[PDB]
Every structure is written in structure tokens, then in C-alpha cells.
Amino acid sequence: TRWTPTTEQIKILKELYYNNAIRSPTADQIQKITARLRQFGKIEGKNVFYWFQNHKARE
Amino acid sequence: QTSTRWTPTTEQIKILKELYYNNAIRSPTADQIQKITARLRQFGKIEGKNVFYWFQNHKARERQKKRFN
DNA sequence: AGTGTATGAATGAACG
DNA sequence: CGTTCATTCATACACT
Ligand SMILES: [Mg+2]
Numbered sequence: 001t002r003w004t005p006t007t008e009q010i011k012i013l014k015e016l017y018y019n020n021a022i023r024s025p026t027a028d029q030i031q032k033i034t035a036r037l038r039q040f041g042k043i044e045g046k047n048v049f050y051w052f053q054n055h056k057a058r059e
Numbered sequence: 060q061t062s063t064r065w066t067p068t069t070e071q072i073k074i075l076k077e078l079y080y081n082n083a084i085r086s087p088t089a090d091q092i093q094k095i096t097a098r099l100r101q102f103g104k105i106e107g108k109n110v111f112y113w114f115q116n117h118k119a120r121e122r123q124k125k126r127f128n
Numbered sequence: 129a130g131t132g133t134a135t136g137a138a139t140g141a142a143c144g
Numbered sequence: 145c146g147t148t149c150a151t152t153c154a155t156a157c158a159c160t
Contacts, residue, residue, distance in 0.1 A: 002136050004156070024148070030127040045127035050137060057149075058135080064140055064151075086145095112141060119146065120139085126146090 003047040009037045013051055023056050025049070065109040071099045075113055085118050087111070 005013065013033075016022045022029060025048065034045045067075070078084045078095065087095060092107045099105045 002155070004136085027123075027126045027146090034127075046124060047136080049123075049127055051135090053148085054135065054137085057151090062151080067140090109140080113139095115145085116139070116141085123146075 003043060005037075005047075005051070006040050008040050009043070012037060013048075013055075017052065017055055023052065025052050065105060066103075067105075067109075067113070068103045070102045071105065074099060075110075075117075079114065079117055085114065087114055 016025075016033065025033060030045050030048050034043055034048050037043050037048065075095075078087075084091065087110065089107075092110050095110050096105055096107045099110065
């Protein structure tokens with residue numbers, strides 16, 4: 001059953017994408033972002049990797 | 060229908076994963092690709108480059124997942 | 129409460 | 145090789 005980002009996670013992901021211009025996070029960034037988002041729910045690095053890859057592809 | 064993207068079949072994926080996990084093939088040589096392609100060709104149209112990419116992607120994504128997880 | 133949509137997940141192909 | 149791009153499948157949820 002797939003990951004569904006919370007309100008606070010989506011807000012943080014969009015801030016990283018738009019305010020900090022992170023389009024294709026490095027492996028280092030993915031670990032750090034996942035740890036930050038894990039405060040709000042169960043999440044793994046692949047969820048963050050796909051979120052940015054999908055968001056970039058459909059922007 | 061106009062895409063030339065190879066569509067692996069369930070049996071082809073089954074054999075590829077056997078080769079990857081049982082036989083420890085990670086970056087098959089040109090001759091290994093020749094033999095693997097000829098075997099998989101019994102189940103669908105497939106070319107050596109399809110096999111080359113499958114192993115390259117499988118190896119890279121195994122490492123990539125360990126990396127960012 | 130059936131359906132359409134947004135988007136999570138996957139992967140073949142290819143680039144740097 | 146790690147990374148990026150392109151399509152396509154899968155489905156959680158909102159709508160009417
Ligand atoms: Mg409505």
C-alpha cells in the first residue's frame with residue numbers, strides 16, 4: 001500500500017523543490033530529506049526519490 | 060504500438076532474475092549476452108541491448124536503493 | 129458509489 | 145558506473 005504524503009510533508013517537499021531549487025536530489029539529500037519527513041509518518045528514501053523524479057517530469 | 064520499448068515477458072524476467080541472483084551475473088560480457096539473448100528469444104522478440112540494459116539497470120538500482128535508504 | 133484524476137511506483141533506455 | 149529522462153502501470157481520493 002503506497003505512501004501518501006501528509007500536508008506537512010508535501011509543504012516541505014514543495015519548499016525544497018521551489019524555494020531551494022532541488023530538482024534531482026543527490027543521494028546525500030535524499031537521506032537528509034527522508035529523515036526530516038519521517039517526523040510526520042512512515043517514509044523511506046525511495047518515496048522521496050520518486051517524489052522529485054515525478055514532480056520534475058510533470059512540471 | 061509505435062513504441063520500440065522492449066516489453067519483457069514473465070518468463071523472460073523469471074530467467075533474468077535467476078541469472079542475476081542464482082548465477083551472480085551483474086555485467087554480462089558480449090558472449091554472455093549472446094547466449095542469454097538466444098535463450099530468451101524463445102519467448103519473445105529481444106535483442107542483446109535489451110539484456111545489456113536489464114542487467115545494467117538491475118545492478119544500478121540495487122545499489123541506488125541501498126544508497127538512498 | 130462509479131468514475132476521473134492526480135500522483136505514487138516502476139522500468140526501459142540512455143546520458144555524463 | 146551513478147544519474148537522468150521517457151513513458152507506462154497502479155491506485156488513493158475527490159467529485160458528482
Ligand atoms: Mg462536486
